[PDB]
Amino acid sequence: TYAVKEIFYTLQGEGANAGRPAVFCRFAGCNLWSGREEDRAQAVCRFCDTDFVGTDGENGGKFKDADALVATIAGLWPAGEAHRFVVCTGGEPMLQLDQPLVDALHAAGFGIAIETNGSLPVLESIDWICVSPKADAPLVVTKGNELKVVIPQDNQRLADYAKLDFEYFLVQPMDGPSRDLNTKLAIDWCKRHPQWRLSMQTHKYLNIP
Amino acid sequence: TYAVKEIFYTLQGEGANAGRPAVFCRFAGCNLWSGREEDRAQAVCRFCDTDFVGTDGENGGKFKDADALVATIAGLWPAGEAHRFVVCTGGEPMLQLDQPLVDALHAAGFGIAIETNGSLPVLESIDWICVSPKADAPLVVTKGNELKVVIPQDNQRLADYAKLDFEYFLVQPMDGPSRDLNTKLAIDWCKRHPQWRLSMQTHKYLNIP
Numbered sequence A, B: 001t002y003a004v005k006e007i008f009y010t011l012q013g014e015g016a017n018a019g020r021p022a023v024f025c026r027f028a029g030c031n032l033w034s035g036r037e038e039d040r041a042q043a044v045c046r047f048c049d050t051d052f053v054g055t056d057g058e059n060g061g062k063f064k065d066a067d068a069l070v071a072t073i074a075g076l077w078p079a080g081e082a083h084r085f086v087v088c089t090g091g092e093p094m095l096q097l098d099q100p101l102v103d104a105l106h107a108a109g110f111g112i113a114i115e116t117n118g119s120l121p122v123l124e125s126i127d128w129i130c131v132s133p134k135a136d137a138p139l140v141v142t143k144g145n146e147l148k149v150v151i152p153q154d155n156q157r158l159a160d161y162a163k164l165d166f167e168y169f170l171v172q173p174m175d176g177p178s179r180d181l182n183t184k185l186a187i188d189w190c191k192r193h194p195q196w197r198l199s200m201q202t203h204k205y206l207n208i209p
C-alpha cells in the first residue's frame, strides 16, 4: 500500500539527468521532517522547499497495490512513445518504495530513478540512484550514481563526500532568501574543486512543475 | 599555428556536461559565417550569439605551436587539481584543431570536448563530440556523443536527427527576441518526444562567462 502526494509529467529539473522528460512520483512523508511548519525549526532537515504532506495533490492518493500505481504513472506518458522514465521522490521515497513496485515499473518499460536523502538503505535494482546527504542525518548509502549535495549547510564536511563511490558529484545551491548567494558559492566551489559539478534547479528558472 | 579568440575558465553551460568546470578555447573564424553583421543576413548560419572575429579577447592571440596553446590552457586550471577538461569551440574549431594539439592536450592530462556544427569531419580521438546541426548546411558528422540541435530553424527535419548514431539527443532554445517563446517550444517538443532532452544555456541564467 502506497501513499502519494502527487504524480505529474515534466522535465527533470535537477542533477545529471536535468532536461530529461520524466514522470515524477512524489511519495508522501519524510523521515527527517514531519512536513509541518511548526516543526521545521527543530527538524533534522530544515531547508526543504517541498510540500509532501498528504495525498491531496494532482493525481495523488492512497493506492491499492503496485499495479494500481503503475497504471497511473504509465498513463501520463505520451502514447506510442518509448524511453519511459520515472523519478521516485517525496518526501523520502525509501519509506515506501519496495521491490514489487520496482519490478512492476520495470515490467512496464520504465527506467527508475530515485531522489533519496541517504539516511535509508536503498534497492540496488533501481537504475539511477541520486543521494542528497543531509548534514545532521546519518549517511548509510555510500555508493550510487550521483551524489547531489545541497550547499551550504552547517556541520557540512564537503570534501569527504568526494571520497565516496559515485559517478557524479554535484553541489546544488540552497533555495531560500539567499539563493543568489548560495549559487555563487556553488560556482566557486566547483571552479576550485573541478571534481564537482553545478546542479541548478532549472525548473524554477523555466517556471515549470 | 592557431588563431584563438579567447581562452577562459568557467562552467560548461550547455549540453550533457552542463555545470561541469572547463577551460574554453574559443577558436577564431567559422565556415558558415564570416562573423561580421553585414554578412549575417546572407550567411549559411544566421543565428549565432557569439563573437569569434579576431584574436583580441581574453588570453586571445596567435599561437606559435601546439605547446604554446596548451601552456596557456593548463595555466588557467586550478593548481594541484585533476579532472582536467577543455571545451574546444569557436567559431568552428575543426578549422584549426588538429592531431598534434589533441595529443598535446591529452599528454597534459586534459579530457577534450568539442562544440562543432557538423559540416567538417572530426578527429575521432576527441573524448566528447558535440554536434549542432545547422539546417541549411551539410551534415558530414553523423556519429558522436551528443547531438545538440538549436530550434526552431526553418527547413529543419527534427525527427530525422533522432535516427543518427548519438548517445544524447538535446534541443536547445534559440536565443534572441523569442528566447522565452522558443523555450516553451523546446520543452513541449521533449515532452511529446521524450527521446529528446532539454538543453538550457544555463550560463546566461547564472550570468557567468
Ligand SMILES: C[S@@+](CC[C@H](N)C(=O)[O-])C[C@H]1O[C@@H](n2cnc3c(N)ncnc32)[C@H](O)[C@@H]1O
Binding pocket: A030, A047, A048, A049, A050, A089, A090, A091, A092, A093, A115, A116, A117, A118, A131, A132, A148, A150, A172, A173, A174, A175, A176, A201
Ligand atoms: C525534496 S527532496 C525529496 C527526496 C529526499 N527527501 C532528498 O532529500 O533527497 C528532492 C531534492 O531537492 C533538494 N532540495 C530540497 N529543498 C531544497 C532547497 N531549499 N534548495 C535546494 N535543493 C533543495 C533535496 O536536497 C533533494 O536533492
Ligand SMILES: C[S@@+](CC[C@H](N)C(=O)[O-])C[C@H]1O[C@@H](n2cnc3c(N)ncnc32)[C@H](O)[C@@H]1O
Binding pocket: B030, B047, B048, B049, B050, B089, B090, B091, B092, B093, B115, B116, B117, B118, B131, B132, B148, B150, B172, B173, B174, B175, B176
Ligand atoms: C557558437 S557555436 C560554436 C561551435 C560551432 N560553430 C557550432 O555551431 O556548433 C557554440 C554552440 O552555441 C550554439 N548557439 C549559437 N548561437 C545560438 C543561439 N542564438 N541560441 C542558442 N544556441 C546558440 C550553437 O548551436 C553551438 O551548439
Ligand SMILES: Nc1nc2c(c(=O)[nH]1)N[C@@H](C(=O)O)CN2
Binding pocket: A010, A011, A012, A013, A014, A050, A089, A090, A115, A203, A208, A209
Ligand atoms: N521538475 C522538477 N524536478 C525536480 C523537483 C521539482 O519540484 N520539479 N524537485 C526535486 C524532487 O522533487 O525530487 C528534484 N527534481
Ligand SMILES: Nc1nc2c(c(=O)[nH]1)N[C@@H](C(=O)O)CN2
Binding pocket: B010, B011, B012, B013, B014, B050, B087, B089, B090, B115, B203, B208, B209
Ligand atoms: N559557459 C559557456 N558554455 C557555453 C558557451 C558559452 O558562451 N559559455 N557557448 C557555447 C560554446 O561557445 O561552445 C556552449 N557552451
Ligand code: SF4
Binding pocket: A030, A031, A032, A033, A045, A046, A047, A048, A049, A050, A052, A090, A091, A092, A117, A134
Ligand atoms: S529529507 Fe528531502 S523530503 Fe525530507 S525535508 Fe529534507 S529535503 Fe525535504
Ligand code: SF4
Binding pocket: B030, B031, B032, B033, B045, B046, B047, B048, B049, B050, B052, B090, B091, B092, B117, B134
Ligand atoms: S556554425 Fe557555430 S560558430 Fe559558426 S555562425 Fe553558426 S553558431 Fe556561430
Ligand SMILES: [Mn+2]
Binding pocket: A049, A050
Ligand atoms: Mn522539488
Ligand SMILES: [Mn+2]
Binding pocket: A051
Ligand atoms: Mn502544496
Ligand SMILES: [Mn+2]
Binding pocket: B049, B050
Ligand atoms: Mn556560446
Ligand SMILES: [Mn+2]
Binding pocket: B051
Ligand atoms: Mn566580443
